[PDB]
Structure 1
Amino acid sequence: MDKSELVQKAKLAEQAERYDDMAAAMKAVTEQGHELSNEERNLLSVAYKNVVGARRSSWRVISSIEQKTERNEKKQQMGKEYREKIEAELQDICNDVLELLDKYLIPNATQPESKVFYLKMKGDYFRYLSEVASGDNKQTTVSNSQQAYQEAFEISKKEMQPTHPIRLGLALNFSVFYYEILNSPEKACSLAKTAFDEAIAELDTLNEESYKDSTLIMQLLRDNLTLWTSE
């Protein structure tokens, strides 16, 4: 099949909220080995965000139930096994995305903004694995998440303006990594506040093309800082 075909399928699938179809289309596009357009990159990202998001949500629900049910009630065997089923799906989905990142997306990235986008994405999917990992596996996924984010951060700091939406979005997600995965509230708040503050200091640099995406993410940075200091 050809690229334009698959892209149109992805777009239809998106509107119909058929994210498995959407992800399959854009995985096929990626495996053709050519650098993705921004439109294509977005479609791939949205597809897998939704596919993995379903499992993250379900896993959290079943984990919570598992903890409410008493250990002597022992209906929690089933909760445990169902949790493990969902975990396995989540791990397979993240593996697929990480395969695409390693094989195609990161190596084909020509511009710094693209490199940052995909290193951030690598950070994100190792973060998702870290949400459900245990033991030595968790140490590995946490470390791999941090490395990808930090490499993205180093490129971003050198090559992109503080108001650029990819730089801001990296800060947003890397700060959540510190808060939720590393249990480091001070580092999380410092990263988010610095990113927010650096953008405000250069607010004049917004333009029609990017003001909406940038200001949306500045609002999200503020929202997390508010959540974290409501504490």
Structure 2
Amino acid sequence: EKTELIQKAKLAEQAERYDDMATCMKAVTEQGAELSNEERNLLSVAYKNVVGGRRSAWRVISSIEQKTKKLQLIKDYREKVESELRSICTTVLELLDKYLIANATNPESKVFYLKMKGDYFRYLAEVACGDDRKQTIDNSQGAYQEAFDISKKEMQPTHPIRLGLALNFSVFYYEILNNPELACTLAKTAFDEAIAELDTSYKDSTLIMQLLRDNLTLWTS
């Protein structure tokens, strides 16, 4: 039943049906074996799209709210989306804790899962409030930081996972903690250190570096 689930996931993906894709990957993960590379990314992409659909909606709604009897109605709808965002995050965080990180068994994988734990807590923080916000933020920061250390200890500065982690960690700095200069330093550093060792897959790394460089241009505009 595992080769099956994986094909249905690759289909669902081609067919842009990410609920299905997710369900499949969640079930593959629950079997409790370590995920291969291709399997990690299938899981990652699936949930990225599922949760991404909510985050998008949440911004549109709050923006429409901030641009304004009818406001109790909008607010209620924002919260329906928030509830959805949380289950999805909880689901993913649960998978990372019960399964993925537990059995990581190598640095590259550990870094991927910790980054992800970082990202999903960050998605929660985008909509959190009061002290819920503080707990959420701490949890995100702890994950990224641990990932950051391991990535520095174990991986080449061109590795797309490490670059990706740097990208997301800087975004966290920039938009969640709101320390914009650290955000820049975090990105510029990763960028520069990668740019050095490119004389050494290239397409995988530079896709992410473009993002680093773009963010830097914006955060200095």
The question of a shared fold, defined as TM-score above 0.5 by the shorter chain, is answered with: yes
SS at match of 2:219: helix
**How far does the alpha carbon of each residue in 1:157-213 deviate from its partner, in whole angstroms, 9 at most, with x for none?**
1100111111111000000000010011001000000000111121222xxxx2111
Residues 91-130 of structure 1 mapped to structure 2, 5 A cutoff: 91-130=86-125
Residue from 163, 174, 177 that aligns with 2:158: 163
Distance 2:160 2:57 in 1: 29
Tell me by how many angstroms 1:29 deviates. Answer: 0.4
Residue 78 of structure 1 is matched in structure 2 by: 73
**Partner-residue secondary structure (3-state), 2:24:** helix
Report the counterpart of residue 224 of structure 1 in structure 2: 215
Paired position in structure 2 for 1:23: 22
Deviation at 1:107, TM superposition (A): 1.0
Q: Residue 202 of structure 1: SS of its match in structure 2? A: helix
Give 2:185's aligned residue: 190
Kindly provide the amino acid, as one letter, of the partner of residue 63 in structure 2: S
CA distance in 2, matches of 1:152, 1:78: 41
Residue number in structure 1 paired with 2:36: 37
Confirm whether residue 88 of structure 1 aligns to residue 83 of structure 2: yes
* Residue 53 (structure 1) aligns with: 52
Aligned-pair Cα RMSD in Å: 0.6
Map of 1:147 onto structure 2: 142
* Shift of residue 112, structure 1, vs aligned partner: 0.4
Q: CA deviation at 1:111?
A: 1.2
Q: Which amino acid aligns with 1:156?
A: S
- TM-superposed deviation, 1:67: 1.2
> For this pair of structures, how many residues does the alignment match?
221
**Runs of at least 4 residues of structure 1 off by over 4 A?**
none
Deviation at residue 28 of structure 1 after TM alignment: 0.4
Sequence identity of aligned pairs in percent?
85
CA shift digits 1:118-151 (9 cap, x unpaired): 0000000000000000011110110000000000
Tell me the TM-score normalized by structure 1.
0.95
Partner SS for 2:45: helix
Distance 1:157 1:21 in 2: 35
Which residue is 1:175 aligned to? 170
Q: Using the alignment, how far apart are the partners of 2:67 and 2:206 within structure 1?
A: 40
Q: Which residue of 2 aligns with 1:3?
A: 2
1:100 maps to a residue whose letter is: L
Residue among 195, 203, 206 paired with 1:212: 203
Distance in 1 of aligned mates of 2:125 and 2:195: 32
Partner of 1:67: 66
Alpha-carbon distance in 2 for matches of 1:136, 1:37: 37
Which whole-Å CA distance do the structure 2 matches of 1:22 and 1:135 have between them?
34
Unaligned runs of 5+ in 2: none
